[PDB]
Short mmCIF file of C-alpha atoms and ligand atoms in Angstrom, two decimals:
data_model
loop_
_atom_site.label_atom_id
_atom_site.label_comp_id
_atom_site.label_asym_id
_atom_site.label_seq_id
_atom_site.Cartn_x
_atom_site.Cartn_y
_atom_site.Cartn_z
CA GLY I 1 -48.62 64.92 -107.94
CA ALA I 2 -51.49 65.28 -110.43
CA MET I 3 -53.70 68.30 -110.99
CA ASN I 4 -57.47 67.70 -111.04
CA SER I 5 -60.89 69.12 -110.10
CA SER I 6 -59.93 69.23 -106.41
CA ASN I 7 -56.92 71.56 -106.68
CA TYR I 8 -57.85 73.92 -109.59
CA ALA I 9 -57.63 77.24 -107.77
CA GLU I 10 -53.97 76.30 -107.45
CA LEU I 11 -53.62 77.36 -111.09
CA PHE I 12 -54.44 80.95 -110.18
CA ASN I 13 -52.31 81.42 -107.05
CA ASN I 14 -49.09 83.44 -107.08
CA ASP I 15 -46.67 80.50 -107.59
CA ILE I 16 -45.42 80.82 -111.18
CA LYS I 17 -46.50 77.81 -113.20
CA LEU I 18 -46.72 76.78 -116.83
CA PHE I 19 -48.84 74.31 -118.71
CA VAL I 20 -47.00 72.49 -121.52
CA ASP I 21 -49.00 70.84 -124.34
CA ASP I 22 -47.14 68.86 -126.99
CA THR I 23 -50.12 67.74 -129.13
CA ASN I 24 -49.27 70.05 -132.03
CA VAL I 25 -45.47 69.57 -132.04
CA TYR I 26 -45.30 66.77 -134.61
CA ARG I 27 -47.95 67.24 -137.31
CA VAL I 28 -48.28 65.30 -140.56
CA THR I 29 -50.43 64.97 -143.66
CA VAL I 30 -50.89 61.34 -144.78
CA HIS I 31 -51.01 60.75 -148.52
CA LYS I 32 -50.66 58.09 -151.21
CA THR I 33 -47.44 57.74 -153.17
CA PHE I 34 -47.29 57.20 -156.92
CA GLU I 35 -46.72 53.50 -156.22
CA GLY I 36 -49.89 53.44 -154.09
CA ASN I 37 -48.10 53.15 -150.76
CA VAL I 38 -48.74 55.66 -147.97
CA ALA I 39 -46.29 58.29 -146.78
CA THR I 40 -46.34 61.20 -144.37
CA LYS I 41 -45.34 64.80 -145.00
CA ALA I 42 -44.53 66.77 -141.87
CA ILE I 43 -45.90 70.26 -141.47
CA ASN I 44 -44.87 72.96 -139.05
CA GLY I 45 -45.95 72.55 -135.47
CA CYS I 46 -45.74 74.33 -132.15
CA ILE I 47 -45.25 73.85 -128.45
CA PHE I 48 -48.05 75.42 -126.40
CA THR I 49 -46.59 76.73 -123.13
CA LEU I 50 -49.02 78.80 -121.14
CA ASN I 51 -49.00 80.67 -117.83
CA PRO I 52 -52.64 80.26 -116.74
CA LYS I 53 -52.48 83.16 -114.27
CA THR I 54 -51.21 85.82 -116.66
CA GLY I 55 -52.21 84.50 -120.06
CA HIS I 56 -48.64 84.65 -121.33
CA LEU I 57 -48.21 82.08 -124.13
CA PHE I 58 -44.73 81.07 -125.22
CA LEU I 59 -45.45 79.61 -128.67
CA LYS I 60 -42.32 77.78 -129.85
CA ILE I 61 -42.74 77.11 -133.52
CA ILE I 62 -41.39 73.71 -134.62
CA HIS I 63 -40.20 73.95 -138.20
CA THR I 64 -40.24 70.72 -140.24
CA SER I 65 -36.47 70.86 -140.68
CA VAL I 66 -36.07 69.61 -137.11
CA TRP I 67 -37.36 66.19 -138.24
CA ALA I 68 -35.02 65.81 -141.19
CA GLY I 69 -33.13 62.53 -141.03
CA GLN I 70 -34.52 61.63 -137.63
CA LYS I 71 -36.20 58.35 -136.72
CA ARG I 72 -39.08 57.58 -134.35
CA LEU I 73 -40.48 61.09 -134.70
CA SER I 74 -43.41 60.70 -132.30
CA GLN I 75 -40.88 59.80 -129.58
CA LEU I 76 -38.41 62.50 -130.60
CA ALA I 77 -41.19 65.10 -130.51
CA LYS I 78 -41.64 64.60 -126.77
CA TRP I 79 -37.91 65.06 -126.13
CA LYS I 80 -37.68 68.07 -128.47
CA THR I 81 -40.60 69.55 -126.54
CA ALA I 82 -38.78 68.98 -123.26
CA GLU I 83 -35.56 70.40 -124.72
CA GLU I 84 -37.31 73.63 -125.77
CA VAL I 85 -39.17 74.05 -122.47
CA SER I 86 -35.87 73.57 -120.61
CA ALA I 87 -34.24 76.17 -122.87
CA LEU I 88 -37.11 78.56 -122.19
CA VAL I 89 -36.81 78.15 -118.43
CA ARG I 90 -33.02 78.70 -118.63
CA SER I 91 -33.62 81.87 -120.64
CA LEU I 92 -35.84 83.43 -117.95
CA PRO I 93 -34.50 85.36 -114.98
CA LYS I 94 -34.56 83.27 -111.83
CA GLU I 95 -37.49 85.20 -110.34
CA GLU I 96 -39.57 84.43 -113.48
CA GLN I 97 -38.81 80.72 -113.66
CA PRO I 98 -41.77 78.48 -112.84
CA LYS I 99 -42.09 76.61 -109.58
CA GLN I 100 -44.17 73.95 -111.35
CA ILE I 101 -44.65 72.76 -114.94
CA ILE I 102 -47.86 70.86 -115.67
CA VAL I 103 -47.80 68.61 -118.73
CA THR I 104 -51.09 67.83 -120.40
CA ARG I 105 -49.97 64.30 -121.42
CA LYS I 106 -48.27 61.83 -119.07
CA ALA I 107 -45.83 60.80 -121.81
CA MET I 108 -44.14 64.17 -121.34
CA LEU I 109 -43.22 63.52 -117.69
CA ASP I 110 -39.97 61.56 -118.14
CA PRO I 111 -38.65 63.67 -121.07
CA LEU I 112 -39.23 66.86 -119.13
CA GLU I 113 -37.98 65.56 -115.79
CA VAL I 114 -34.76 64.44 -117.46
CA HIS I 115 -34.25 67.77 -119.25
CA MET I 116 -34.95 69.61 -115.99
CA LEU I 117 -32.58 67.66 -113.71
CA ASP I 118 -30.61 70.91 -113.27
CA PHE I 119 -33.74 72.43 -111.63
CA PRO I 120 -34.55 69.96 -108.84
CA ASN I 121 -36.89 72.49 -107.22
CA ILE I 122 -39.18 72.82 -110.27
CA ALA I 123 -42.01 70.33 -109.83
CA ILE I 124 -43.02 68.44 -112.97
CA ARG I 125 -46.66 67.32 -112.68
CA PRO I 126 -49.35 65.61 -114.74
CA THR I 127 -53.00 66.60 -114.67
CA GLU I 128 -56.30 64.75 -114.74
CA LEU I 129 -57.78 67.93 -116.49
CA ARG I 130 -58.49 66.99 -120.17
CA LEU I 131 -57.38 70.51 -121.28
CA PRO I 132 -58.44 71.34 -125.08
CA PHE I 133 -55.12 72.96 -125.91
CA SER I 134 -54.79 70.85 -129.08
CA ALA I 135 -57.34 73.27 -130.54
CA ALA I 136 -54.85 76.15 -130.31
CA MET I 137 -54.21 75.77 -134.04
CA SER I 138 -57.86 76.66 -134.60
CA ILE I 139 -57.00 80.22 -133.49
CA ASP I 140 -56.37 81.87 -136.83
CA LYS I 141 -53.47 84.11 -135.82
CA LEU I 142 -51.60 81.24 -134.13
CA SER I 143 -52.11 78.89 -137.06
CA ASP I 144 -50.90 81.64 -139.44
CA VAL I 145 -47.62 82.30 -137.62
CA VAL I 146 -46.91 78.56 -137.36
CA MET I 147 -47.57 77.83 -141.04
CA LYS I 148 -45.65 80.86 -142.34
CA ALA I 149 -42.50 80.07 -140.32
CA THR I 150 -39.45 79.24 -142.44
CA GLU I 151 -37.16 78.59 -139.42
CA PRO I 152 -37.47 77.83 -135.68
CA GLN I 153 -39.00 80.81 -133.90
CA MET I 154 -40.55 81.72 -130.57
CA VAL I 155 -43.55 84.06 -130.57
CA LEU I 156 -45.11 85.55 -127.44
CA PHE I 157 -48.83 86.14 -127.13
CA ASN I 158 -51.30 86.89 -124.37
CA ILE I 159 -54.01 84.29 -124.98
CA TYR I 160 -56.43 86.29 -122.80
CA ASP I 161 -56.13 89.49 -124.87
CA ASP I 162 -57.11 92.26 -122.40
CA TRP I 163 -59.66 90.19 -120.49
CA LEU I 164 -57.79 90.40 -117.19
CA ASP I 165 -58.58 94.13 -117.07
CA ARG I 166 -62.20 93.09 -116.42
CA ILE I 167 -62.22 89.45 -115.16
CA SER I 168 -60.14 87.14 -112.89
CA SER I 169 -57.64 84.59 -114.26
CA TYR I 170 -59.88 81.70 -113.10
CA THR I 171 -62.69 83.21 -115.19
CA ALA I 172 -60.38 83.96 -118.12
CA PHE I 173 -58.97 80.36 -118.19
CA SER I 174 -62.51 78.88 -117.85
CA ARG I 175 -63.57 81.07 -120.80
CA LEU I 176 -60.49 80.01 -122.81
CA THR I 177 -61.21 76.31 -122.11
CA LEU I 178 -64.86 76.85 -123.16
CA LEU I 179 -63.73 78.47 -126.46
CA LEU I 180 -61.06 75.89 -127.22
CA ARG I 181 -63.32 72.96 -126.32
CA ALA I 182 -65.93 74.35 -128.73
CA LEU I 183 -63.37 74.84 -131.47
CA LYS I 184 -62.22 71.26 -130.90
CA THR I 185 -65.75 69.84 -130.98
CA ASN I 186 -67.02 71.72 -134.06
CA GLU I 187 -64.48 74.17 -135.46
CA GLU I 188 -66.76 75.60 -138.17
CA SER I 189 -69.71 76.26 -135.86
CA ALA I 190 -67.43 77.77 -133.20
CA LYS I 191 -65.74 80.12 -135.66
CA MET I 192 -69.08 81.24 -137.11
CA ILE I 193 -70.19 82.07 -133.55
CA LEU I 194 -67.08 84.14 -132.92
CA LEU I 195 -66.99 85.97 -136.25
CA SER I 196 -70.62 86.17 -137.47
CA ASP I 197 -71.06 89.80 -136.35
CA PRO I 198 -68.81 91.96 -138.58
CA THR I 199 -69.18 94.99 -136.29
CA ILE I 200 -67.15 93.22 -133.57
CA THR I 201 -63.58 92.91 -134.76
CA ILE I 202 -60.29 91.42 -133.62
CA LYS I 203 -57.76 94.09 -132.72
CA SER I 204 -54.39 93.81 -134.45
CA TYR I 205 -52.71 92.98 -131.10
CA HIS I 206 -55.42 90.49 -130.03
CA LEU I 207 -56.44 86.91 -130.84
CA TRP I 208 -60.18 87.05 -130.13
CA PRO I 209 -62.89 89.63 -130.96
CA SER I 210 -63.50 92.73 -128.84
CA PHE I 211 -66.71 91.54 -127.21
CA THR I 212 -68.30 93.57 -124.47
CA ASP I 213 -69.07 91.89 -121.13
CA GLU I 214 -72.68 91.27 -122.22
CA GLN I 215 -71.55 89.98 -125.59
CA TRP I 216 -69.15 87.52 -123.91
CA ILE I 217 -72.06 86.16 -121.86
CA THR I 218 -73.97 85.61 -125.08
CA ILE I 219 -70.99 84.06 -126.87
CA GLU I 220 -70.29 81.77 -123.94
CA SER I 221 -73.90 80.57 -123.95
CA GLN I 222 -73.68 79.83 -127.67
CA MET I 223 -70.50 77.77 -127.11
CA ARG I 224 -72.18 75.70 -124.40
CA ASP I 225 -75.13 75.10 -126.75
CA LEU I 226 -72.73 73.96 -129.49
CA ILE I 227 -70.89 71.55 -127.20
CA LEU I 228 -74.27 70.15 -126.17
CA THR I 229 -75.60 70.09 -129.74
CA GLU I 230 -72.61 68.16 -131.11
CA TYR I 231 -72.83 65.90 -128.07
CA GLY I 232 -76.34 64.89 -129.18
CA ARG I 233 -75.54 64.57 -132.90
CA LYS I 234 -72.68 62.38 -131.66
CA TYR I 235 -74.34 60.10 -129.08
CA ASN I 236 -77.85 60.37 -130.60
CA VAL I 237 -79.49 62.12 -127.63
CA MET K 1 -12.66 22.46 -94.67
CA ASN K 2 -13.28 24.98 -91.85
CA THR K 3 -15.47 25.12 -88.76
CA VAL K 4 -17.69 27.66 -87.04
CA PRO K 5 -18.26 26.36 -83.51
CA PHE K 6 -21.11 27.53 -81.31
CA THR K 7 -20.69 28.03 -77.58
CA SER K 8 -24.26 26.73 -77.14
CA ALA K 9 -27.80 27.20 -78.47
CA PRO K 10 -29.91 28.61 -75.63
CA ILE K 11 -32.92 29.61 -77.74
CA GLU K 12 -34.78 27.74 -80.44
CA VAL K 13 -33.69 29.03 -83.83
CA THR K 14 -33.61 28.18 -87.51
CA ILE K 15 -29.99 28.42 -88.67
CA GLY K 16 -29.00 28.99 -92.28
CA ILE K 17 -25.57 28.31 -93.71
CA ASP K 18 -25.47 29.52 -97.32
CA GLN K 19 -28.44 27.93 -99.13
CA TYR K 20 -28.99 25.30 -96.39
CA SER K 21 -30.95 25.51 -93.17
CA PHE K 22 -31.82 23.46 -90.11
CA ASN K 23 -33.67 23.78 -86.83
CA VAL K 24 -32.12 23.82 -83.39
CA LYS K 25 -34.32 23.35 -80.35
CA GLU K 26 -34.00 25.41 -77.16
CA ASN K 27 -30.89 24.22 -75.27
CA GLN K 28 -30.30 21.43 -77.80
CA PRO K 29 -26.68 20.17 -77.59
CA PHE K 30 -25.49 21.89 -80.76
CA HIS K 31 -21.93 23.13 -81.17
CA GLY K 32 -21.80 24.40 -84.71
CA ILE K 33 -21.00 23.75 -88.33
CA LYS K 34 -18.02 21.89 -89.75
CA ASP K 35 -16.68 21.01 -93.20
CA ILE K 36 -17.28 24.52 -94.54
CA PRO K 37 -15.68 24.84 -98.00
CA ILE K 38 -12.60 27.01 -98.06
CA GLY K 39 -12.37 29.44 -100.95
CA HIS K 40 -15.83 30.99 -100.87
CA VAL K 41 -17.49 33.65 -98.79
CA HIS K 42 -20.28 32.21 -96.67
CA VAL K 43 -23.29 33.49 -94.73
CA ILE K 44 -24.60 32.10 -91.47
CA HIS K 45 -28.08 33.33 -90.66
CA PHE K 46 -30.71 33.09 -87.96
CA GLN K 47 -34.47 33.25 -87.53
CA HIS K 48 -35.64 32.90 -83.96
CA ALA K 49 -38.55 30.52 -83.49
CA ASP K 50 -40.45 32.92 -81.24
CA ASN K 51 -40.01 35.96 -83.52
CA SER K 52 -39.71 35.17 -87.20
CA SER K 53 -39.30 38.95 -87.45
CA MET K 54 -35.70 39.99 -88.04
CA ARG K 55 -33.73 37.43 -89.93
CA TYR K 56 -30.09 38.37 -89.30
CA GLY K 57 -26.72 36.88 -90.08
CA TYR K 58 -23.04 37.26 -90.82
CA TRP K 59 -21.00 37.19 -94.00
CA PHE K 60 -17.57 35.72 -93.39
CA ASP K 61 -14.60 34.00 -95.04
CA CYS K 62 -12.88 31.38 -92.86
CA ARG K 63 -9.54 32.28 -94.42
CA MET K 64 -9.62 35.63 -92.62
CA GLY K 65 -9.74 34.30 -89.06
CA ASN K 66 -11.23 31.78 -86.66
CA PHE K 67 -14.89 32.65 -86.07
CA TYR K 68 -17.43 31.32 -83.63
CA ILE K 69 -21.02 32.00 -82.57
CA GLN K 70 -22.12 32.77 -79.03
CA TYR K 71 -25.58 33.75 -77.87
CA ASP K 72 -25.75 37.04 -76.00
CA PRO K 73 -28.69 36.97 -73.52
CA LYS K 74 -28.53 40.75 -73.07
CA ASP K 75 -28.74 41.71 -76.74
CA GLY K 76 -30.85 38.65 -77.51
CA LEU K 77 -29.03 37.31 -80.50
CA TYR K 78 -26.46 34.88 -81.81
CA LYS K 79 -23.27 36.91 -82.28
CA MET K 80 -20.29 36.12 -84.42
CA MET K 81 -16.96 36.59 -82.71
CA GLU K 82 -13.32 36.15 -83.64
CA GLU K 83 -11.06 34.01 -81.46
CA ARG K 84 -7.47 35.26 -81.64
CA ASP K 85 -6.03 32.35 -79.58
CA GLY K 86 -5.63 29.86 -82.41
CA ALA K 87 -4.51 27.10 -80.06
CA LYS K 88 -7.59 27.56 -77.91
CA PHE K 89 -9.75 27.52 -81.02
CA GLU K 90 -8.28 24.36 -82.53
CA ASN K 91 -8.59 22.68 -79.13
CA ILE K 92 -12.27 23.63 -78.74
CA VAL K 93 -13.13 22.60 -82.30
CA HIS K 94 -11.40 19.24 -81.91
CA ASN K 95 -13.39 18.46 -78.74
CA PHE K 96 -16.75 19.33 -80.36
CA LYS K 97 -15.98 17.22 -83.43
CA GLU K 98 -14.90 14.19 -81.39
CA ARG K 99 -18.22 14.49 -79.53
CA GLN K 100 -20.02 14.85 -82.92
CA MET K 101 -22.03 17.89 -81.82
CA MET K 102 -21.76 19.66 -85.21
CA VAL K 103 -23.72 19.65 -88.44
CA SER K 104 -21.66 19.04 -91.56
CA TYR K 105 -21.91 21.51 -94.40
CA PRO K 106 -23.87 19.31 -96.77
CA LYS K 107 -22.33 19.85 -100.18
CA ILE K 108 -22.96 17.31 -102.92
CA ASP K 109 -19.97 16.89 -105.21
CA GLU K 110 -21.90 17.60 -108.44
CA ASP K 111 -23.19 20.88 -107.05
CA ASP K 112 -21.71 24.23 -107.97
CA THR K 113 -24.71 26.27 -106.77
CA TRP K 114 -22.91 28.23 -104.08
CA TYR K 115 -19.93 29.00 -106.33
CA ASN K 116 -22.34 30.10 -109.07
CA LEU K 117 -24.13 32.47 -106.66
CA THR K 118 -20.95 33.97 -105.15
CA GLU K 119 -18.47 33.77 -108.05
CA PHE K 120 -17.69 37.51 -107.96
CA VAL K 121 -18.42 38.18 -104.26
CA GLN K 122 -15.36 39.18 -102.22
CA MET K 123 -15.22 39.66 -98.46
CA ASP K 124 -13.25 42.89 -98.99
CA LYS K 125 -16.05 44.38 -101.06
CA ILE K 126 -18.71 43.19 -98.61
CA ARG K 127 -16.89 45.07 -95.84
CA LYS K 128 -17.07 48.29 -97.88
CA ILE K 129 -20.83 47.88 -98.36
CA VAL K 130 -21.35 46.93 -94.68
CA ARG K 131 -19.15 49.29 -92.63
CA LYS K 132 -17.88 47.88 -89.32
CA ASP K 133 -14.13 47.73 -89.78
CA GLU K 134 -13.36 46.42 -86.29
CA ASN K 135 -14.71 43.00 -87.40
CA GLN K 136 -13.59 40.76 -90.26
CA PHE K 137 -17.16 39.48 -90.76
CA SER K 138 -20.22 41.53 -91.64
CA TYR K 139 -23.62 41.71 -89.98
CA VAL K 140 -26.75 42.09 -92.11
CA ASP K 141 -30.44 41.86 -91.22
CA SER K 142 -33.90 42.19 -92.72
CA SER K 143 -34.47 45.80 -91.67
CA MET K 144 -31.22 47.50 -92.71
CA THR K 145 -31.77 50.30 -95.17
CA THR K 146 -29.56 51.35 -98.03
CA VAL K 147 -27.83 54.67 -98.53
CA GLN K 148 -30.28 55.35 -101.37
CA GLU K 149 -33.25 54.55 -99.11
CA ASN K 150 -31.79 56.92 -96.49
CA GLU K 151 -31.70 59.64 -99.17
CA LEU K 152 -35.33 58.96 -100.14
CA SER K 153 -31.76 56.28 -91.04
CA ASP K 154 -28.75 55.41 -88.87
CA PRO K 155 -25.70 55.73 -91.18
CA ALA K 156 -23.55 53.18 -89.30
CA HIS K 157 -26.19 50.46 -89.81
CA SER K 158 -26.78 50.94 -93.53
CA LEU K 159 -26.04 49.07 -96.73
CA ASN K 160 -23.65 51.27 -98.73
CA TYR K 161 -24.54 49.91 -102.15
CA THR K 162 -23.54 51.96 -105.16
CA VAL K 163 -26.32 54.45 -105.88
CA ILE K 164 -27.94 53.88 -109.28
CA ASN K 165 -30.55 56.42 -110.31
CA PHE K 166 -31.65 56.61 -113.94
CA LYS K 167 -33.10 60.13 -113.62
CA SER K 168 -29.99 61.73 -112.17
CA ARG K 169 -27.34 64.08 -113.50
CA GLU K 170 -24.77 61.28 -113.10
CA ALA K 171 -26.78 59.14 -115.54
CA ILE K 172 -27.51 61.80 -118.15
CA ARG K 173 -25.01 63.91 -120.11
CA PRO K 174 -26.13 67.45 -121.02
CA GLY K 175 -27.12 67.46 -124.66
CA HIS K 176 -27.63 63.70 -124.69
CA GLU K 177 -30.79 63.63 -122.59
CA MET K 178 -32.92 61.44 -124.85
CA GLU K 179 -30.01 59.32 -125.98
CA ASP K 180 -28.68 58.57 -122.50
CA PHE K 181 -32.13 57.96 -120.99
CA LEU K 182 -33.28 55.58 -123.69
CA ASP K 183 -29.85 53.86 -124.09
CA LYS K 184 -27.97 53.70 -120.79
CA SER K 185 -24.63 52.51 -122.23
CA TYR K 186 -22.86 55.72 -121.17
CA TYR K 187 -23.98 55.32 -117.59
CA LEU K 188 -23.14 51.58 -117.52
CA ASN K 189 -19.80 51.65 -119.33
CA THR K 190 -18.26 55.04 -118.62
CA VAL K 191 -19.78 56.14 -115.30
CA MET K 192 -20.26 52.80 -113.56
CA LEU K 193 -17.82 50.28 -115.03
CA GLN K 194 -14.85 52.52 -115.83
CA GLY K 195 -15.50 55.13 -113.13
CA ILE K 196 -16.84 53.45 -109.99
CA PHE K 197 -16.60 49.66 -110.20
CA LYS K 198 -13.44 49.64 -112.37
CA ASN K 199 -14.32 46.23 -113.85
CA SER K 200 -17.31 43.95 -114.48
CA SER K 201 -16.28 41.52 -111.75
CA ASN K 202 -16.83 44.13 -109.06
CA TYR K 203 -20.17 45.10 -110.63
CA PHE K 204 -21.29 41.48 -110.70
CA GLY K 205 -20.10 40.95 -107.12
CA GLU K 206 -22.29 43.75 -105.83
CA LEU K 207 -25.20 42.47 -107.90
CA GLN K 208 -24.74 38.96 -106.49
CA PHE K 209 -24.42 40.25 -102.91
CA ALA K 210 -27.60 42.33 -103.27
CA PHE K 211 -29.54 39.32 -104.49
CA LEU K 212 -28.31 37.11 -101.65
CA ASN K 213 -29.24 39.70 -99.01
CA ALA K 214 -32.67 40.00 -100.62
CA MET K 215 -33.17 36.26 -100.61
CA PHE K 216 -31.74 35.34 -97.22
CA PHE K 217 -32.93 38.32 -95.18
CA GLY K 218 -35.86 39.60 -97.22
CA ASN K 219 -33.98 42.90 -97.34
CA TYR K 220 -36.06 45.23 -99.52
CA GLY K 221 -33.32 47.72 -100.36
CA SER K 222 -31.10 44.89 -101.47
CA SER K 223 -33.83 43.69 -103.82
CA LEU K 224 -34.10 47.20 -105.23
CA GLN K 225 -30.34 47.25 -105.82
CA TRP K 226 -30.33 43.84 -107.52
CA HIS K 227 -33.07 44.86 -109.95
CA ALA K 228 -31.47 48.25 -110.69
CA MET K 229 -28.16 46.60 -111.61
CA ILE K 230 -29.94 44.15 -113.93
CA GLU K 231 -31.97 46.90 -115.51
CA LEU K 232 -28.94 49.11 -116.13
CA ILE K 233 -27.33 46.37 -118.18
CA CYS K 234 -30.51 45.36 -120.01
CA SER K 235 -31.26 49.00 -120.88
CA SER K 236 -27.83 49.50 -122.47
CA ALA K 237 -27.49 48.90 -126.21
CA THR K 238 -23.70 48.46 -125.95
CA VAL K 239 -22.56 45.82 -123.48
CA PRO K 240 -19.45 43.63 -123.79
CA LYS K 241 -20.36 40.20 -125.07
CA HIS K 242 -18.69 38.46 -122.13
CA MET K 243 -20.64 40.54 -119.62
CA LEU K 244 -23.94 39.56 -121.24
CA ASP K 245 -23.05 35.89 -121.28
CA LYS K 246 -21.93 36.05 -117.66
CA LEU K 247 -25.05 37.97 -116.59
CA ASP K 248 -27.23 35.27 -118.18
CA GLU K 249 -25.42 32.63 -116.10
CA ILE K 250 -25.61 34.72 -112.90
CA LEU K 251 -29.34 35.33 -113.24
CA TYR K 252 -30.04 31.73 -114.23
CA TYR K 253 -28.59 30.44 -110.96
CA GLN K 254 -30.33 33.15 -108.93
CA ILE K 255 -33.72 32.33 -110.44
CA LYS K 256 -32.99 28.61 -110.04
CA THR K 257 -32.22 28.99 -106.34
CA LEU K 258 -35.04 31.38 -105.44
CA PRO K 259 -37.70 29.66 -103.29
CA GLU K 260 -40.71 29.19 -105.54
CA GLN K 261 -42.99 30.61 -102.84
CA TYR K 262 -41.08 33.92 -102.57
CA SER K 263 -41.16 34.83 -106.26
CA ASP K 264 -44.18 37.10 -105.84
CA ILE K 265 -42.34 39.38 -103.40
CA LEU K 266 -38.71 39.04 -104.63
CA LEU K 267 -39.27 39.54 -108.38
CA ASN K 268 -40.24 42.89 -109.92
CA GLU K 269 -42.72 42.17 -112.71
CA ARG K 270 -41.93 45.40 -114.55
CA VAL K 271 -38.16 45.02 -114.54
CA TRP K 272 -38.22 41.39 -115.66
CA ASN K 273 -40.76 41.83 -118.47
CA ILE K 274 -38.89 44.91 -119.65
CA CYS K 275 -35.55 43.11 -119.49
CA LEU K 276 -36.63 39.87 -121.17
CA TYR K 277 -39.08 41.23 -123.76
CA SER K 278 -38.55 44.95 -124.46
CA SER K 279 -34.97 45.91 -123.64
CA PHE K 280 -31.91 46.00 -125.86
CA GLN K 281 -30.85 42.67 -124.37
CA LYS K 282 -34.28 40.99 -124.74
CA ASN K 283 -32.67 38.23 -126.86
CA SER K 284 -29.30 38.04 -125.08
CA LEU K 285 -30.33 36.22 -121.86
CA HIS K 286 -31.27 32.84 -123.27
CA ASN K 287 -30.77 30.70 -120.16
CA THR K 288 -32.46 33.23 -117.88
CA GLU K 289 -35.43 33.67 -120.20
CA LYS K 290 -35.91 29.91 -120.47
CA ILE K 291 -35.86 29.29 -116.71
CA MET K 292 -38.09 32.31 -116.04
CA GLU K 293 -40.69 31.23 -118.63
CA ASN K 294 -40.77 27.69 -117.26
CA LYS K 295 -40.68 28.52 -113.54
CA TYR K 296 -42.56 31.85 -113.28
CA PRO K 297 -44.76 32.31 -116.37
CA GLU K 298 -47.33 34.06 -114.17
CA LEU K 299 -44.97 36.98 -113.57
CA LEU K 300 -44.71 37.34 -117.35
C1 VZC Y 1 -63.44 72.56 -118.42
N1 VZC Y 1 -63.79 73.79 -117.74
C2 VZC Y 1 -64.70 74.66 -118.37
O1 VZC Y 1 -65.11 74.39 -119.49
C3 VZC Y 1 -65.12 75.95 -117.70
C4 VZC Y 1 -66.16 76.59 -118.50
N2 VZC Y 1 -66.98 77.05 -119.15
C5 VZC Y 1 -63.08 73.99 -116.52
C6 VZC Y 1 -63.26 75.09 -115.71
C7 VZC Y 1 -62.50 75.23 -114.57
C8 VZC Y 1 -61.54 74.29 -114.25
C9 VZC Y 1 -61.35 73.20 -115.05
C10 VZC Y 1 -62.13 73.04 -116.18
#
């Protein structure tokens, strides 16, 4: 069934599983027309498909041409998401296919179950985890590849950089959730925290800066502060 | 007009014949039911007074043989049997009628309720759903499970309704996943009507039979089947006009006949609100929507 605070070490066991987040698939800017009505302009989006044990991110870029001449785009986006995840699973060797796919929004369950009817042994599950994966487009390198795309494209990343050389997956995913939650709560503050020290850089093949272990402890403390800070400024506490 | 004689009534029992019912006391001099309309299937059903658990009964058509009821004190129930000696049968029936030991099937002349509830129900199709080919009549009870329920336990004692499953490869064409899930016309018209049922009459007959088993026996799997067959039609954007008009009539008479006090357990709130108010056919079931809104506005 659903994934929650009780069963979270399950994410880091040796059963292949993927999270699927569809919150950045269908993206629009809302603007006024010359006649003073309102219209939307789609912009490129992405499916966020993540193996939480290994850090492997299958970023399927959704080019705006997929919406051309389609109706009910918020509904279509869920089915397009499920179509692309199904295609991804089919593309993987059997021993790499997931045993479970965890969708971050319950509205993805029926679309994905229907696309995955060929794989009756892959469990499709919701989660009670409010995972901050919508903030993935606050990671500069991911936002850049999405916005520069001129056609559908899949790009593979490790969202943990080289952290697993030094820390467990549970610790890496907790750190990622801390960073993404901060970026979602106050993007500017979070990015200043990550990039304020010019002597710590982002390697060409990485997404995040090359912090030492002690520097990560400091960064993580600053992200907790921020999430608390904004929580006061928000609720007046 | 045909007759189903009873050898006797050794145990107190409530007896149903179609939509009617009456009480028989222990060892009351009761010898059956006469004046049964020829041309329709019928159901004779039983609820023992000492164990209102297990309603059970028999679907039959008096044109297919001479049938009678006899209590079996070993198996503890009223059994339907066929008498092959037609002379013996006519003799017995004549004696019980002359002694006036039979209830008369109590049909008012204005009343088409039973026809309207069984219009498409055929004994031959009942016998395929309820497999016991050695008998011309078919036993059903409250506890019998469906083939779909057995998939999700005795196979000989199951209701072999047509499996309908909206999240199944049968329902969904590759490459049309969203289309076929959100608009089930393919599944209704090509898979079910053309492929399995062959025509709408057979579809409606199974739907009607499922409802009647749900109502008379409180058979849960039958209720599931009835709702699934409604929902498949209502969730299809392309349905023949004559099927929609007939469905509206079928459902009207089912809702009209349903005991008011059983609506909470025999009516699925989700399916009916979806069908009447959200589905493709939300404005196509005028008679059904009117009786539902006036009889069961709570459910909606
Ligand atoms: C939300 N979260 C965190 O922010 C961890 C940190 N910091 C979390 C951690 C483990 C499992 C589920 C959630």
